[PDB]
């Protein structure tokens, strides 16, 4: 049949097992423990543990509400202007009850491939719906994201 | 007959692929064991990457080869959106099949862009269980390292 690769078999399911960038990992652990997740753009070279880190952060923040509290937008699914205008807006407008301190999660992995217009429409729906949902970006190059998005996020290098 | 010899003398099985030995022995170990990960053939043109993989796919896929493989080309007149749609439709379908492990024959990946390669590796992530990918390229420096880390890298020498 098939054997599970050690890259996925031994993938850390918690933020503590992730090594490297001790300050940022500890701060993410503190955010997950307390709550009030900030908007951040995780940037850096590929294969250093950004997608795993953000997934573990979402796991530790939500728990059982992972399926209905996270909307993941990757390059495989379409991420055009209509996507941002309709499904991200509907997910932000969705009424999901969470314990205090937690918020809905919107993860856009490989955000460097986003079109300019989709990013331009993204800043307003993230500024207006910041009280219910929080966005998380993970891109290889931080220069491919326009300045307004960086002005509304704490860029993680 | 009156045809170019390039397609006339293709190796119908893995035994007629000469020159390359380590990769063929690894393929034989894989088929004997049964593990078929994601593969990546690259190197100078004419080393026989396409011939080796078509021999592999035919000797595994018997008669329903003509249905359950699909040979792709990144340089054709389709575009990134069309190739993405084709890959999703061929991977997320699970048609009338005797045995699974769908195979992707994607040639000439050196012309693929960064966003297209990221989409390809994301589709590889999502549909690993049912579909196996064997994207083919020629130069290893024209491919993003994220795509290299998700395929069994096999260099081809003259």
């Amino acid at each position: 049949s098939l054997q599970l690769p050690w890259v996925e078999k031994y993938r850390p399911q918690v933020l503590s097992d992730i090594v490297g960038n001790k300050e940022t990992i500890d701060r993410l652990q503190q955010i997950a423990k307390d709550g009030n997740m900030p908007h951040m753009i995780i940037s850096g070279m590929p294969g250093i543990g950004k997608t795993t880190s953000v997934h573990c952060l979402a796991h530790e923040l939500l728990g059982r509400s992972y399926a209905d509290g996270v909307l993941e937008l990757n390059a495989s699914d379409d991420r055009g202007i209509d996507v941002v205008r309709n499904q991200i807006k509907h997910f932000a407008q969705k009424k999901l009850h969470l314990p205090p301190g937690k918020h809905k999660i919107v993860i856009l992995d490989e955000a460097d491939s986003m079109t300019a217009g989709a990013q331009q429409a993204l800043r307003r729906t993230m500024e207006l719906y910041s009280n219910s949902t929080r966005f998380a970006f993970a891109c290889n190059q931080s220069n491919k994201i326009i300045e307004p998005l960086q002005s509304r996020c704490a860029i993680l290098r | 007959e009156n045809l170019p010899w390039v397609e006339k003398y293709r190796p119908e099985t893995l035994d007629e692929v000469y020159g390359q030995n380590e990769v063929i022995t690894t393929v034989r170990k894989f088929v004997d064991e049964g593990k078929l990960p994601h593969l990546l053939f690259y190197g100078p043109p004419g080393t026989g990457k396409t011939s080796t993989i078509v021999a592999l796919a035919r000797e595994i896929y018997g008669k329903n080869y003509s249905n359950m493989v699909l040979e792709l080309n990144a340089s054709d007149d389709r575009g990134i959106d069309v190739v993405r749609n084709q890959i999703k439709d061929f991977a997320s379908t699970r048609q009338i099949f005797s045995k699974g492990f769908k195979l992707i024959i994607l040639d000439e990946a050196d012309a693929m862009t960064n966003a297209a390669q990221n989409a390809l590796r994301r589709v590889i992530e999502r549909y690993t269980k049912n579909t196996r990918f064997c994207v083919l390229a020629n130069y290893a420096h024209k491919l993003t390292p994220a795509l290299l880390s998700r395929c069994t890298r096999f260099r081809f020498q003259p």
């Binding site: 941002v84 205008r85 807006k89 331009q120 429409a121 993204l122 800043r123 307003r124 729906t125 207006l128 | -």
Partner: protein, 44 residues
């Protein structure tokens, strides 16, 4: 918004139709709505 809070004196007194880029700014989708908002009174 701070000017509205100053002049109105209450948060609910003023009403702002804040137009963003997250919806469609097309003529056939918002023309009548904006004319209705700018023509008639607001229920309160």
């Amino acid at each position: 918004q701070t000017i509205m809070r100053e002049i109105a004196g209450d948060d609910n007194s003023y009403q702002i139709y804040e137009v963003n880029s997250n919806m469609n700014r097309s003529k056939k989708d918002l023309l009548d709505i904006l004319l209705d908002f700018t023509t008639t009174h607001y229920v309160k």
